[PDB]
Amino acid sequence: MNIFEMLRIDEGLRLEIYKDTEGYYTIGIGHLLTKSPSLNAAKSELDKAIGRNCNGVITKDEAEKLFNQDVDAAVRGILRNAKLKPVYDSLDAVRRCALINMVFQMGETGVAGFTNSLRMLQQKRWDEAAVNLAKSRWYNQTPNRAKRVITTFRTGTWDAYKNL
């Protein structure tokens, strides 16, 4: 299991514009297009992102290309962020994937806000961090995905995904 397979399980693959759990316009493997209510705004962002007139639909290849960019941007983002970098540096390989997953879903800014949880992971207080991470809007809104990530931080293994 690796970061790509993990995120592909959590996000799904859709080749037509869709609305994510929060109601925003998304395409492919969790590639957020716009928070705007307009399907037109969305379709415009889409063509800008692909470099073609897509009219709301893309190919498997295009979806994966966007996915490759997003994962790369997530990693570079963590590495450039004063709050996340040190946490990332401190973790083992599996737990690193867990933090990457959070940043792909909620952005650098959002994860950087989990101050107390970041501190606990850095200290390697596994169980305590899992309990703190569960006290969030994140967990309440997308509980099955949050549980999978949380279990990953808790155990340092891919058990939560070995099912899936």
Curated annotation (Swiss-Prot):
GO MF annotation terms: lysozyme activity
pH dependence: Optimum pH is 7.3.
Organism: Enterobacteria phage T4
Phenotype for D20C: Nearly no effet on specific enzymatic activity
Sequence positions that bind substrate: L32, F104, S117, N132
Annotated signal peptide: none
The name this protein goes by in its record: Endolysin
Effect of N132I: 5-fold decrease in enzymatic activity
Reactions performed catalytically: Hydrolysis of (1->4)-beta-linkages between N-acetylmuramic acid and N-acetyl-D-glucosamine residues in a peptidoglycan and between N-acetyl-D-glucosamine residues in chitodextrins
GO terms classed as biological process: cell wall macromolecule catabolic process; defense response to bacterium; peptidoglycan catabolic process; viral release from host cell by cytolysis
Alphabetical list of CDD domains matching this protein: T4-like_lys
Annotated function: Endolysin with lysozyme activity that degrades host peptidoglycans and participates with the holin and spanin proteins in the sequential events which lead to the programmed host cell lysis releasing the mature viral particles. Once the holin has permeabilized the host cell membrane, the endolysin can reach the periplasm and break down the peptidoglycan layer.
Subcellular location: Host cytoplasm
Matching InterPro entries: Endolysin_T4_type, Glyco_hydro_24, Lysozyme-like_dom_sf, Lysozyme_dom_sf, Phage_lysozyme-like, T4-type_lysozyme
Main location: host cell
GO cellular component, one term: host cell cytoplasm
Family to which the UniProt record says this protein belongs: Belongs to the glycosyl hydrolase 24 family.
Family annotation (PANTHER family): T4-TYPE LYSOZYME 1-RELATED
